[model samples]
Target chain A: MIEIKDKQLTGLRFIDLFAGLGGFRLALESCGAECVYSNEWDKYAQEVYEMNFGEKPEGDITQVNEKTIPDHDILCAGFPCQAFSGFEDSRGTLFFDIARIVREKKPKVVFMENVKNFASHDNGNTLEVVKNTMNELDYSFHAKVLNALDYGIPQKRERIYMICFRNDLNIQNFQFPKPFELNTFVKDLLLPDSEVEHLVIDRKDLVMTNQEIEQTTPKTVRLGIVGKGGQGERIYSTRGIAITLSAYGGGIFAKTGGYLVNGKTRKLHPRECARVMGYPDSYKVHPSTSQAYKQFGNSVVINVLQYIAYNIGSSLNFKPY
Target chain B: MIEIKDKQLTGLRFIDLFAGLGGFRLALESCGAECVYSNEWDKYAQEVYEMNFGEKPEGDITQVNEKTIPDHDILCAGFPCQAFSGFEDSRGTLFFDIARIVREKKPKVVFMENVKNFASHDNGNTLEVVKNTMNELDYSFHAKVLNALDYGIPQKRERIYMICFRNDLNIQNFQFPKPFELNTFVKDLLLPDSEVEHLVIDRKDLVMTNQEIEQTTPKTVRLGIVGKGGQGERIYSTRGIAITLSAYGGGIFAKTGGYLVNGKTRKLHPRECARVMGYPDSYKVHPSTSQAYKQFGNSVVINVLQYIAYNIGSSLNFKPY
Candidate 1:
């Protein structure tokens, strides 16, 4: 996931739907697919997306008509996971909006992501309805749960990725990319301790079960606990994977868990959070620290999406640019 | 505490009572004090003591005559903290046995340790009786709670240390050693991860709140937790202090809490445990891994004792060897 062959999706175009911070655009464009259009509803996210990609994404996919969007070879959406009942009977729900767009646009491929529980939501009924709707629209839907850790990012984020091919593509037996070696770790993407001094949290009750570290595993390495050691109260080691970053993670360390570096426990810097989420260092983070952490925490892992996009390109017999 | 000026009590002779693993002997002997006698009841501990110190300690102090115990300048006893009533009336109790010996032997210095709560045991009645008992025996008593963390050796062990001087010596205003800089941490004492592979614990629910370590604070750095994250269930950081090792800590990583090293969480090796308690590496440990952990967990922090002993030597105007 850390190393994707560039230009794999050459000569193709993709629309970034629900593109918070343009993570889908970054991933697809890295493989040479052009971002023909983008949409995001959050104002702060739109600001960040514009800063990084120089386009203020169209706001509110629910209000916008898919007919207005430019024609594209692929449709990408890291749509929010919301609980909804039957797709046909759930018109006000967001999934219905996405389904409406798909019916109108009918892109060559549909790439999407949501929480890992998406496959099991409503006792599998939610997934059943979505699969049935796509099948009725003449698309071949395939889905699987994948972890960010397996994709080389040191974060324990598991999500279900859905890749659907147009019926005419004849792209049978298309599989997700196999996991690759993970030499790069969370520690490999940290800022100097001096730069993140403000992120240091001082709590008298912080309990570090182990003292010396630096692990190679691409999973969250919990170093210690601060306050009750629940959810966001825990501290993590930089050498291991980061816990899943959450937009609403509220604790001393907040969205990012604490790391023990240079004798201090602190949250990762916004740029470091970006790196953990597989964004290149060149991408500009939001101006506000809080907003930046939330942005990265909410955004998809760019590298994971890129690898999946590469496989999609391979299945379609796309050539390098 | 790590660097007590060696041989400060060169001319003094001391006796170790309830000498579990000879920790009191190790601390006092390091300062060149002669150990005139030793006593412990546990067979396994006696074996370890004999292996390292070349003599099995006299067993069961209650049965040994006070007159038979050789005269010494100091009496060092880390006697067990047991619930007892008034000192004189409680003849069958362990404290009563120590008091009887002190009354008969009339040693110049009485160095003792017990659980930190010993000061407030029985609603302060226990400490009240001990202080009065020492005063009645013509000794001046001073007691304070000291943590192994403050004294060096990255472990969060706190115990009440009581130092008594024969009234005639008039050693007044004596202070515990000033807290020193902590450059050496738990990581500095770890065996290569390979040597302690048997101690590695793999738990599916082992939650690492923090990973990416190497901290320098002299306090327990909890890395993650296994099972219920209670007592020994917690993992620690090697860069920080270790949790209080316990004689009866029951968990996947018992006694010494698990440490995250090279991607796995594990308990400290016996030698690493020894280092944290300020025991020299050359000191032999019990053959049984379980026994060795319990021995170290129950033992005193040698460096803390050594510093206090050096202070006592200064009060008596003794010179280094």
Candidate 2:
């Protein structure tokens, strides 16, 4: 969905860590960067990743020797956001592993992604550790919370993107991509009615707010409730933006969120979720619809990743020809 | 562990829906309730459930006909939380399936659990729907947010427990368990040092706040950080409460937040996590530590559940012997 003027990352190499569905890989590869290595623990995700890309990523990043990892120009990891106290736990030490790899390889740039709450989590101590870690690693860190809806995606997924440059690069004035208008909504990305008919639900307790939106914008528009309108129980207008997708969310519309389509309520199909996530239609998803939902829910928005990668390239003095 | 004075739920039957690790069943069964039916969709969770309970719960509640479900005195379901906008999707409509069975079977009580966020999610619409649906179905709904720490567990897991009474019972007065002092911390439930040596993490960048807690309480006490001290990145003193465990959280200590134990930093082992979640030592956790961590992270604290079930039984006019 992103139109790039130049393949500025040409000849650059990057590694994907905790790579769920190759969102970072897709964005980087599109910018002419080669993926030297990738790691993902989930077998279903690995299957989907290998299905789309020609290679299976190594499993259990902790088990993989850091010294064995190939050197690359960039290190990309979308680490999961759990509470990280300054104390050491085997699971929490993943960031340090990234730090260990970065320390060993000293890549030119380090780019990472996490949930939006990562910044405010633990009263800013979590972000503090990251910034301090980057500082200690001799890299200048630039971190910001960006929303997918702010870019071109129709879903409102807010995540923190952290980019760091090696001390010698002298890249001081890097800026995140500016917010843009969303041109599409859930309806625009919906598959044919027949394909998703099975997702539709018939309930007697459907309650419609019937609120009209004079203009379509990048925000969720609530149309009605099916029953008590709890999470997954509420319905949104197709003309509006989709809520954030979640891997463990449950409800009738679980994960993809519910939408009111053609006087009926249904969840966005897996392909539609992919489209909303800025994935190209050619990208193959996991075979299971449930797995597909979880993969996309946990995935990075390709459009946002691409835009950031472009900025990273430009900051690295790659000329736009 | 809570010592129950009365097995108040003796002779009562309940059904389990979306039974992840059988947390609800563990609590109710301990109160002497009989489990008539159980359903769980995840294969791993099902395996663990079967391993413990000796019965494989039926797969996918949707596929099970409502009429075929046996009559029960109470219905137990810990439904997943997602945006509930009054529209229906196949997965989001799981609550409706519970409701359909409730309408058909008219169980004497309906008990459910969900994350604390579910109360305010979707601008309070999600909780609103659940409450309204129960009222419409001729049940008196009483919901409250209770913390595991308040009920003798070391972890700070706050979840909304919703209980409903059939109109025929005419039970208007019901009270949740009162919060008590938490006497135990992470260190108190820890296994031997040599047994959990593998869970210890060694890092040079460990940052300690070195703060002293004047007294142990039911709140999470921050002692120091390993890295940016984000969620799962934080280290806590064994003298205080633990943070909420997460199923998907990653970090050095992840799932079982990191703790400063015996002058070394390590994560709580699977057994420790199980104990903090109030699982009996006799219960068999999944052989895979990873699965065990996820199961416990997603599970309800058995102590809290026991306390609540005791209250529920009292409201049902079960005489305490």
Candidate 3:
């Protein structure tokens, strides 16, 4: 855990809900804010969380009563987006549970994050419902679609960040974190000695396609593709940043897209997944390689979250009325 | 999905991590496994997954974090296997990540699935690492390389199933689900419309190998092979079950592996993939044909999982404690 300055967020108490591997917790902790409560529903995630925080979180917010939850100034939720995202149907939306909690507690500040398309899901019905519910609760809401690549990270991920202030705060015009320049490509994060030699997909009839790529770019260069130009079928240059990491993604590349390292195409290593997600090398990961990939795929990038939280915290005025 | 009933596992909580269209969820839920939480990271997976479950999963487990995870007796992860089980090296050994989590959580049971070669990668070091890790975590481990066909599903999938009991449980024996008599074949899962025209792979380099599969008691027959005999390159008879679905796998057939259907060699439709994986006809899939292929390739056969869950539950004295 990286330590922040004293008294930066001295009086602030926060709760980390749906605290996946502690992205929100780490971010808030870095800002000198103290977390009083948190929750995650995956056993592996709980392991990783407990390994780091030394606290085993309660599971399934739906099963947890709001009255038992500790009271705090800020409520952070990087809620699951399956339910409201446009790509999926509304039936799978888990957002309703989050709404239920908000309706019950009416926390002073609600900070939420999700995939970029959450705002446009159901032609904006999902977002509207959330905003309207917040409004009904008398909270002033601010939402923005920010990409990690545009901020401090090189991975190309766009997410919707919603920050709501309880109505009485009377704060408006909340600013999202600014996009910073990170010209870094995937090459910078490569393992030393190309330790990924064993990671390559070795098939004789490997497809090689020639797509034009900038010579100077550290991003992927498309040489050729084998198979049917599907996910794992395509090959990428080592120079570029990786594609989005997904928990259930499939293809030759699967979650992390395939790369052409040492004349072979293969997926990224678990450590590489850490680098892509902006987890500092020092942070310990779950021991299972498959679990780590799934964990990272399900986790948030640390650096980006920290930057966003910094901005969100800076925008607020501390008062213990 | 196959019906499973276990007295002991009636209410044990588990979440389907990497919940690809709810394969594990369907199986576990059918066997009276109550879902505490679930998530799938892909857009397409969320789509079809939500369609079936009437709830979109939380996206990206990496973003969710450990403190928020729920506790359960069993941890089910059918993570992507292309990196390990497919023709890749380090990428294929993602079991290391899974091991990390098992070490942390120490769940009573850890159920995971992957391609056949996963146990044999790196001269068996991969499997050894898994075994060693579980042992280090004080869990008694059991693993086997089994086929989906042998497990009573129609797919000719050779996969490794690992079952680990936490050392403290004092559970002496665990039995994998028994294989049932082969009752279905690839032809039984074929699409029923007039639109099976796009499957023929037209190439000047197409090859027809004279190597024929000998007729046996189980009716395995290789009518012909088209390309390099790599994935999707071979043509099989509808008389036999289809090869294991692969996400990163490619060939003329792509993820579904080409077959001689309707007198034309073509890839299986997304619907066919659902059928092969034991997904019901009513199970909705991602509309994007490409995403559908990826989702199915990553999915587990619900029937297989349920059968195994049933056996495990029965062996455990049918109690959820």
Candidate 4:
């Protein structure tokens, strides 16, 4: 179901590190790239990846030898953000491992994703270190905070995408994709009412605004509150965009966030979550509802990644078109 | 089991609104004041209140007739923060109900508590409106942002406490309690190791700094992160103060927060949560652990209210005193 207008990178090879639910894989494969290697530590994620792609990812990147990894043109990693997440202490050092791999592999290009807060985390020192390290490795780094909603997704997930090119390639002009207006909202991606009937919750404490929404541009439209309305305790209208999904959110309506459909409050189904993330209907989801929620909540929106990958393809040079 | 140094408010009477687990009632009763009326909409909270105080609080403050309410000297309400939380719409109008009650009762003093963000919410317009309304009602308002750790509690809960004295008292000077050194940390308030073994969470992804903490002053000490380290994803040192307890937080350690004890990570028990909030051991928590966690997370720190209540007692000009 993945679609691409031009298969520019038909024979390009890449490696997937921290390969969570194949967000990067889906994007690259759609553009005719070959994934020669992939690594993921979580068992549940590996299971779903195997189910969808017919190959289980290698586990624990730290233990795997770089020499054993297949030679590739690009490296894709959505590394953990814990190390530089100001709330954390020492984990921000995981960037060094990525640097270690890049030093040995020396791929022609490097692509990565992280939380938007990573840009300002630790007073910008964390990002500074990453840029300096990439420069030292002779790769030109370009990074920017991009929201999924701006790239045709109905979810408001803002993340920093870093794209680096090897200096030897002489790719001095690399550009990110321009933001486009969204033509869809949560309602457009929702499953049938019969499929999600069990998710409906009835509560007496709902405080609704009942405001008429006139804007067509995508953004979260808050409708009501179930409790104190902190974080996941809020309710949103399907006529608007979805809030950022969380891996471990709580409340009566959490993770996917609450939605008002047919006068009842309910959370989106796993397949609905998959659709909002831009996954095709053909993509397989995990069997466990809780695990599926966590996986989708932590996944990258495929449409944004696909757009960026297309731009990356346009920037790179090969012997022939 | 509640304790106070002086019964300075012996004959004073106060009404409780939005009361959760009787935080205000416990503090006032310890200072020898009587609670004439109480209102809480949640059934679990009402059950816990009645279990400890021998009375179920009335439901729905908006429906209660102001004229039918008993006369009281003070008003205590930790009204819901949903409206001003910057996340909800019309619910923020709940403050008008409090103003309506003040117009009718004209209590001698008004005491209230809310999250720290309330001070800057809506660019301080919300707070300005509350101050102006109290001033218009012929009352002098004194407001301060206080922390539970500053008042001998082992939790870093910052909240705005507002005190208003009627004009007839001619009590212009009111000073908040000074910060005192804490004599306890999380370790002192924890339950036995054996009882909390099941709560231990072992993860291979923990990013710990293992820094040597020498300071003894009350503060949240970050030791590591279980995941991305967002909000509730953080793990703290038992040798320091606990993070702010949230009623609707997520992660491996939700609400009570993750603490490192005996070389293992685990969340605090409900009893430990009560201790950190300065609740006495004799207080009966709700039977459901989930409900208990939510109630305690939403409740105000008892020591802070007690300290502020004592100061309010000093400012009032009761003839007999």
Candidate 5:
């Protein structure tokens, strides 16, 4: 295993916006960057964020005055995408808020992320606005759609990462995280029998057909049905990677798709979700299972962010006077 | 306002477990009840509880075991009811675990609340287990279905309030609060024109036709339609009462039902939801709007609980010796 040198980006300062569960903060700080400011609107996310990092985030970004915000070299945000993707209307979009912030404070670099569809949303107008606005703010903008599966984590989560660098830096070349070999699978992070036994859901309709369990990589398995093969109805194998965690999904398997373990089907525990999202095992979750599920579902993949931050930091020119 | 004097029952000093927005604590404490312990799992609910009461509630009742739980006279718990409401029960069914605590502590009073359907859930088997368990514990049990609308609140929220007094009390009768005429309606709580402006939906497909403008008793008014009259699609009159808030409900009107204010159809803002739920204006909502909606939707109506508590307290034996 290649150990990331926490020595790489030390002494650099960054700010986290819409820092859901502080995934960006964890990634950046892991590279030894100092986070001076962080903001998240959700209390549960903020609680989990605070539980990990010792500060509760400031309230709404729209209401936050840009001048009052502390200066930092890197600005990070996972701006809300639900309004654009789910609502799909221009009026509901919160992108303009990020654009306005960038326009005011031209940080050395701005890192952002959103659902994959954000680029093609509203016939590409949303993507155009984001790119054009950052360009107008004198920052070179670049974006790419990356998935956790492609980046080595087993979960199939596709998201777009946007990086904007201040033009005067004369550094136009910055690559997003490159894909790596898949090392971690759902089984690598499974809870012990005692911790997860109660989580197994026993139903009469569980269909276990000639199920040969393979304890190998990329091994896929499907088990019996609970209800309609809706969100929560379908079950998968711990041998393979988990599916994407969704925010607006329904069915019993709504957010975290169900998994077959110990002759029963159950939703992925929050800890398992954190693992798949690239959040370190040490990341704190709300004690309430329901809240934990919701918080992790809304969080960013930490390893993905860390990988990108590494590329962004190394690409920067740190010339001394 | 009627003042409730607490009846002195000599036993273990108990706390309000899962205090919610402090509904049970308000009721139980008014009867000279000294809470030896308390727990509330939701962070936002804790914030609101703290804002009104100046004490942050302990999160996650499950983490506080029977040995750690301070001795108390009554165990007041309105555990989350989502699982018992016949919705796709996932994490919603954490209630059974709460039952485990009741068995461990064996408090003098066990007060619990849930959606009306809980008693009939799994076809009377679920309720039967709860009743039979309490019966086996030698506690006198009573439960009745009540509604916020019937208790003078405008919202049409039906729930089962259960009270179990230890057999030693010898109290033969206790009556839940009765339905009363609402002295105020949704119109009374409407924000002024300036404040309500942002709440108006400006969509072209708004359907407003049969909405009642005025009512002596509050009821939900159907004014117009935004799209399909689904969860968030229907426009309602402020002159009428609001509908029940739900945690996992979808659509634009996801949690709080939509309201017709000014010329638009929009969902109730968090503050409006707090007001309707009998949460004080000073109560702090969770920073995340979505989480706030979920917590409030799953929480107790403080006024209704308090009113019921008043009756429960008054009905206690008045022997001053």
Candidate 6:
């Protein structure tokens, strides 16, 4: 996931769909892959995406027809897991929206991502549908679930990644990036309390499940319950990893995967969320504070995507600049 | 192939057959995989294996009989490429001896190594026979050729690696260990001048093909022709990688890859060969220099085996340790 300096992806071009904060773009470009297009729906997300990428992602993909999409070597398409799980017809959702682009552009590679449950979602029928659909489209589908923390981030965000290759390429047994050592932790990604004092929670009945972690681990260490079984009920020590960041899961104060600071607790600021999610601080955030939080919470881990894209480029014989 | 400190292979048991210098055992034990049995017929090689592993390998695999071998989870079997390539029946050679052991033991995993040509030998029938034999034995066969240099060592030793898993394990798309950046070279493995003065070759008519290698590369850089079309026809700069090490192929003075230090070339010392082949300094060598060269030339690269062994242990869920 560390950016390989080889620029192994130099010759290839990719398009980012549902491009939140240009995570896909950041990862691919880090390897010299050109990004020709992007489609992200949210205004705040598009703002941050454009702020960093210097180009606004075209508005909602539903309004843009697939025919207008430029041909590219790879397609980065990820939407809500249910995007394809539901919708069969005109009443259907954005499932075909991506398929529509895929059908027209016929990019050499299709890279897709979704929530971890996407594999078992809809009684596994959703994955089957996607599999069956890719088969119908004459592509070999490879799927695997990977955790961000395992890829060197400070957050435990396990997501399902799917890679598809056109049959003519004769690709075989595509593999997902393997989990590596987790050296960084939530504590490593945190900013000083002075900067995030506003987000700290002064709580009573805060408990400690375990006193001291024997050594760093790639899991959110639950530090006992707090205030009335709410999101704060389970506090995570920064010595371990951060829980998955979520935009509107509505858990409590947990959109940040609440971290215990000294004796008190604090939610991650957008900057910390960016770090935990594998984003560099150089990346620009949305002007609105809450909007930046929502944008980051809903973004992909750049390191994880960097690894996947590096491999994709290698398979395409693009590992040399 | 670097030894991982994780010892992910603890709790698993393995057997090494045709064990040369205990490369398999060294790699496996680095990750805590217990070596339960070993077999090798060579007298000098056995000495080194015993010296390092603290156990004399059983002599003559042909005489050792499989039933006497203990139950183990993994079998590390690597012999001459033709170990199973030719012959049939009593006159059939050693091919069936392995089949016999596997037939009786049914180890959960079979790890194999052979020269790169093993994949194409006997018009690919060798690979077919091995594949068919494993299938007949209810194991899934996976084969790939990996290079020692690509995996991190400085020698361009490309060999075919085959890993087999019992069907019951449900292994899918077993991937060969991927290549990593190579920062090591023949120069890094060289002994100090005073120590290897005796090995330096006095040469005349030395030529320079290219000088001042801008950057290090994972290939033997041919410097220039030295003396009449002999083993010294081409000299390799130590700044680059070493050519493949061989035993009795008899390519002039090339048994050492004839590395050029200053102006002249020198054969690698036995210790240098050990380092080139991924043996630790602590590993004792044969008393006879010629015998040590023979052993090192024919030996497996421990680091290459280390990486593969790591993955094999990973598949067996032996990584927890």
Q: Against the true structure, what is each candidate's TM-score?
A: 0.51, 0.55, 0.52, 0.61, 0.56, 0.48
Distance from true location, Cα of B239 in model 1, Å:
52
**Cα lDDT of model 3 by residue, A155-214, tens digit:** 767788888988887665467767766677776677864676645554433557664354
DockQ agreement of candidate 4 with the native complex: 0.27
| Tens-digit lDDT string for candidate 4 (A120-147) | 8778877877777788888999999999
- Compared with the true structure, all predictions reach lDDT values of 0.81, 0.83, 0.70, 0.83, 0.71, 0.77
DockQ of each: 0.01, 0.04, 0.11, 0.27, 0.07, 0.00
> Candidate 6 at residue A263, lDDT?
62
Give Cα distance to truth, residue A201, candidate 3, Å: 1.8
Clashing residue pairs in all predictions, respectively, total 42, 61, 78, 3, 20, 2
Candidate 4 lDDT over B1-321, as tens digits, reads: 237879878899999988889999999988889999999977788999999999999987778888888899999999775434311223346666677788899999999998898889778867777777888888888888999888888899999999999998888667899998888888888888998785676666687877636665477899888766776778898889999887877787888889988888888888889999999999998877666888998899999999889888877744554
lDDT (tens digit, per residue) of candidate 1 on A1-321: 245566779999999888998989988888889999898877788999999888899987777886787888999988876545434754656677778888888899999998889898878877777787778778999999998888778788988999999999778868997877777777788899889886776545577887657447776777789656875688877777788887745555667878887788888999989988988888999987866876888789988898899889888884335
Screening candidate 6 with a backbone cut-off below 3 angstroms (N, C-alpha, C), the clashing residue pairs are: B8-B319, B209-B223
Better of 3 and 5 by TM-score: 5
Model 2 stretches with alpha carbons more than 4 Å out: A86-92, A211-215, A318-321, B1-321
Docking class of 6: incorrect
3 or 6, which is superior by lDDT?
Answer: 6
- Please provide, for model 5 over B125-205, each residue's C-alpha lDDT reduced to its tens digit, 9 standing for 90 to 100: 567666766666667779998887766667878888888877766666677777787776666666666764534445434
- Per-residue alpha-carbon lDDT of candidate 5 for residues A36-72, written as tens digits (9 for 90 to 100): 9998876667787888888899977778888778878
Model 3 lDDT, residue A271, Cα: 83
Candidate 6 regions with alpha-carbon error over 4 angstroms: A83-91, A212-214, A230-232, A318-321, B1-321
True contacts kept of 6: 0.00
CAPRI-style docking class of model 5 based on DockQ: incorrect
